[PDB]
């Protein structure tokens, strides 16, 4: 119920889903939406469109906070890397900064075995 105006949007863009979480500048979450909970399952959930719908719903969940400015942190290789950012600017927020925070091990742990499909 306290105003913030300066938040941070975190985009978790995996191959199967997109999670959008808006926090303040200290990491405290204010609201979230996901492509899977916006009415899409299966092959529809892992699309750029479903990611866009999630970005809108997240913008609505935090409209009480009076957020005006956003930094954007994108994480992952999924199809919702760009449509979520496009929708966050179309939602009225002023996109101040865009950053990739995808984790990269500097070697790290052995990955799972290759799939034989």
């Amino acid at each position: 119920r306290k105003q913030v105006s300066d938040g941070v949007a975190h985009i978790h863009a995996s191959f199967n889903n997109t999670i959008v979480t808006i926090t303040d500048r200290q990491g405290n979450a204010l609201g979230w939406a996901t492509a899977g909970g916006s009415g899409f399952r299966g092959s529809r959930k892992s699309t750029p469109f479903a990611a866009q719908v999630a970005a809108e719903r997240c913008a609505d969940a935090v409209k009480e906070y009076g957020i005006k400015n956003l930094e954007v942190m994108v994480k992952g290789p999924g199809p919702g890397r760009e449509s979520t950012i496009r929708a966050l600017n179309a939602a009225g927020f002023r996109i101040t900064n865009i950053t990739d925070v995808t984790p990269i091990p500097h070697x790290g742990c052995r990955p799972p075995k290759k799939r034989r499909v």
Partner: protein, 70 residues
């Protein structure tokens, strides 16, 4: 990839820049390469194949500037 949108810079211009800084970092190719484990014999096999292809293709290109098609 840290794109600071500067003043008066429209959003689309910043969006195309961030995309450029990502591709120039190879983050997407690096993530896709780390999704599953590649046996060291497999890594060596495909490093050699890419070098044989880079070479044998250039050597045919030289033989295609010294020949007429019609």
């Amino acid at each position: 990839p840290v794109i600071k949108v500067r003043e008066n810079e429209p959003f689309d211009v910043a969006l195309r820049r961030f995309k450029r800084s990502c591709e120039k970092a190879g983050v997407l190719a690096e993530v896709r390469r780390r999704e599953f484990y590649e046996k060291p014999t497999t890594e060596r096999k495909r490093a050699k194949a890419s070098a044989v292809k880079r070479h044998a293709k250039k050597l045919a290109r030289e033989n295609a500037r010294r020949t007429r098609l019609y």
